[PDB]
Design a protein around this ligand. Sequence first.
Ligand SMILES: [Mg+2]
Ligand SMILES: [Zn+2]
Lengths: 358, 455, 148, 98, 71
Amino acid sequence: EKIFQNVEIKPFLIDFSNLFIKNAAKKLFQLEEQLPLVPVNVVMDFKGISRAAVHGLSRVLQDEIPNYMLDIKPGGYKIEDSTDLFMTEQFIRNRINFIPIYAKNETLVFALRSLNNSCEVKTIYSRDLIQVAGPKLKYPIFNPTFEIGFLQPGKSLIIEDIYIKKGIGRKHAAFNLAVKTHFSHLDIEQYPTDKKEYMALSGYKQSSMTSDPRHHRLGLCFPAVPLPHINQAVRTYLKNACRIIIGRIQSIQKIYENFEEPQPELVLFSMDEEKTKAIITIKDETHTIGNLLKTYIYEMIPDISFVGYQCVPHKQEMVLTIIHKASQEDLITLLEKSIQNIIQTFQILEKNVDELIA
Amino acid sequence: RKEGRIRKSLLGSQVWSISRSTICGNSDLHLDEVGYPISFARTLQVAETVQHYNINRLMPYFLNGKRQYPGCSRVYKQITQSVHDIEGLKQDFRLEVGDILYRDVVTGDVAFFNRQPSLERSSIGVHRIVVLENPKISTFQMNVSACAWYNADFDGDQMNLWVPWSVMSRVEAELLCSVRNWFISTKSSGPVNGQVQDSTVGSFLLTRTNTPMGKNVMNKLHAMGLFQTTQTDPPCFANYSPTDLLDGKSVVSMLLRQTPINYQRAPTWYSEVYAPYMHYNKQDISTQIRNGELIEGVLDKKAVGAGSSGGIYHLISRRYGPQQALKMIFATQQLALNYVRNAGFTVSTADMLLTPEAHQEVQEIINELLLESEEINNRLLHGDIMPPIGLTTHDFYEKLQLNALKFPDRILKPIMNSINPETNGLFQMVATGAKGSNPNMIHIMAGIGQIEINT
Amino acid sequence: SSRSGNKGIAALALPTSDMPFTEDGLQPDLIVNPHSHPSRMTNGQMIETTVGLANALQGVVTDGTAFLPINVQLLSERLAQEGLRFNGCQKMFNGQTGEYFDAAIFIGPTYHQRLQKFVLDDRYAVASYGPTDALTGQPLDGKRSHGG
Amino acid sequence: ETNQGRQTGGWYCFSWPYRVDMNRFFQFYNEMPLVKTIAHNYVIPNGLNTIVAYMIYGGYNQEDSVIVSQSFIDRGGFAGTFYREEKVELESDIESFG
Amino acid sequence: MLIPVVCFTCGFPIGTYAAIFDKARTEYIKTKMLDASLQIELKDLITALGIPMRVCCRTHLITTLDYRKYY
RNA sequence: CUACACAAA
Ligand SMILES: [Mg+2]
Ligand SMILES: [Zn+2]
């Protein structure tokens, strides 16, 4: 049913009742209201779902959902002769790559044509990132308050090909989306760890080597979503994460369905006492899919001889090993139905996302 | 001189086909495996003479060339007596019997690993090459348990690595200089490798009877997950239900059943200096393994530690061979690390802080020491210090002061009253033999005492 | 290295999802083995972490100069007053599996230094050919001479 | 630390762009220590206030190894520019650049 | 050379409020009166900025050196 | 190549 229960969405807002904050924002940004893009803290309660699935959703939302960043095309940084010698290409590119953007269009291209004709050091801000291509921006994709850099007197900084690049966060952290805010299990009792007799323990009354929590509270912060369309952005993020997990799982469903053909990413044995060993190696696969697969195969086959995976940091792959007292067809059927259960779980998650955020 | 003809040019040599890089740790490498960056694997080459039996295997290397890995760099033509670079060898496209192909280093190749200074017989050992295909890695990765061969650590140490390319040198590297031959010290006749640091304390935590949460048990899923990275044939859990609870000793025995040994010894965990304090569990203070079954007791430095004569790995080597001992070291290390993946281990500033009562007790002990020293001084003032023959009054007074200011063995009582042995990371590191000593804990928590230079 | 002299070589780099995180989402930049402490006695780093945990919450920068009066009990009580545990330990979850550790993990801000010893500079690999000495006919010496 | 505190990367010079220096590393981001000492009243602090977890995590940090956050590396943690120089003299009128 | 665009540890965008924080902190230190300035608590200022009570984010916000203050 | 200096283990 409703696996994804109550959600609390709370944007992070500048408190302008603070005199110093308001004075600084007014004097150097002429800003009296909240910024166009705000960090949004989404706290989600999940009931009746394995911790593997909730943590897989969290991991995907962190650094496995595709994201967009601003990058400079090679040759975009103009060397020229009056350019600032302290604002190197590498420093400025690092600053630009990590500006959180909420971009709905990949075609947008920006430029930074800054010049310091004063006698003092001038600071380049994100408000100086002028759009030079793509459709005219009806809403900003980044906040104009970032300090891109500072120009020495008489110096300039021209960057001409600041474009929008897509990727995932595990390849490069500039595509990281969600920062972790809270994770807890609501169906495991907790100690009062303020006491000296519990402060060396996690706090949970059950050892993690035996506990199987099914009620979780997951809090994730999204770095820059538009102020009016907060719920829409959060819903899109959650649904996209669920779809990403479903697609990556279907990538293995296809491998199972092609088991009669000897594909290199799935091998099967006939070890001994009716037991067959299934080893599924998938390159560039993370702990999300391996842990989801192991958990759901285990849930389908509680009497399994062995199920386990390993994502060695080198070899850049996930290897899942299943040993079961069954035929190869029987084991493949069981694995297929476990994958179907994973897909059904995340489809229900997507549906509940739609019904909740609304 | 050291840099003359003999010692520099004759007794030593500068050599080609050799690499050097910083070494880091890699828990997923076997003890007889070294991680080789792919950039170095395409620099160092293996000379493979082309014959009929290996032409099909050498064909992919030739076709890949220097463009894709695994490839090659040079081909020696038999009928030309000339080497040709592969990039310029577009017009040859023909490998003849008697040709020598210089192909890239691949996973499974033998390589000589060396750390300087080379003081021991194990300072040069042969490891199986595991090529790290990540281009961002330029370190020589090795298992932390292999460091005992070279007296190495990962604080900036650099090691030489060269891959034998000749058939004779490769044969002898595989058969003679493999690190399985240096598992037993030529010096002390005992084992060289074993669990170090994280794995020693992890073995203790896994095999200890009771945790602060109760009995040290895990469900079937976590018992299975302990064997995920062991890289051997996993045991069978078909007779275990998800609700069933397995002890750490049960899974350890499931690992140790492959090479059954008999072991009976008290662990490092059980010390008489801690016996007046603590509450030693009866099942923890006597380690017994019967035919691979860990009947009782914890596994720590005495049983699984590196250089532990009579330890479980020494027995495994004696009964099944040193290579089996290396494989068992890797497997037990994986078990311990996968256990601590859930148990967790830490050290905190509060782990080394005495309670106010224990602080007052330590102050009283130090005050009694200073009182005895002041009594000796009062005796000196009255001329009551009478040295023995052959000792001056100054030397006798110095000996009296040195003995008076020694910390009593009861200095551990306030330390251990402030310590929970079940949750103290510092104490558990010290007591299990993973790292640290009783003087370390006393210096950190109670007091340094008397500084002695040349006794 | 830290300011207490604890050298370290970067052995593994993990993505943000693989790194352990506290209940409130805090995750480390570096993971330092607890076995580096007991023999090396670098308690200053440990105390600095304990103090900086409360400094970050209070938004202050305090003085940790040597021989200034120090009371580790009062610093731990300061941690407790800041809303943390008496020790700086927290409930941590494994990033790769999502399962909490049974032990609370000591995590906090420890000032770390990047020593100018770069593996890209230190690494060297030479093939079977290169410049040789005119006299001995042996390879030249080391990376600088492009063979050795 | 006295030895290691002097090989630490940082702002090795404040006038680096006008210098052609060799084997010099300029680290972009520097932080004051959260627990500073009096030495930072007179010299610039080199380094960052990294969050450090003192824990066993897979046995990759044993024997002085450290596990780093790839994201912390990507964001600029201890990132900088290494500089080398290539000075070549013209000797006499015989040689020229072309 | 500046406060980073995002927190080095978790990637939270503290660079959004880096400039406002710098100038508001200079102002708030001025009314509160080199070392005594560093011991002024900025918890309320950073909270009013919208930054959460995160050890890493406040650490990198308050400790990062500004190159413009030194060059 | 011959000093010398600064470093690493
Ligand atoms: Mg060393
Ligand atoms: Zn942060």
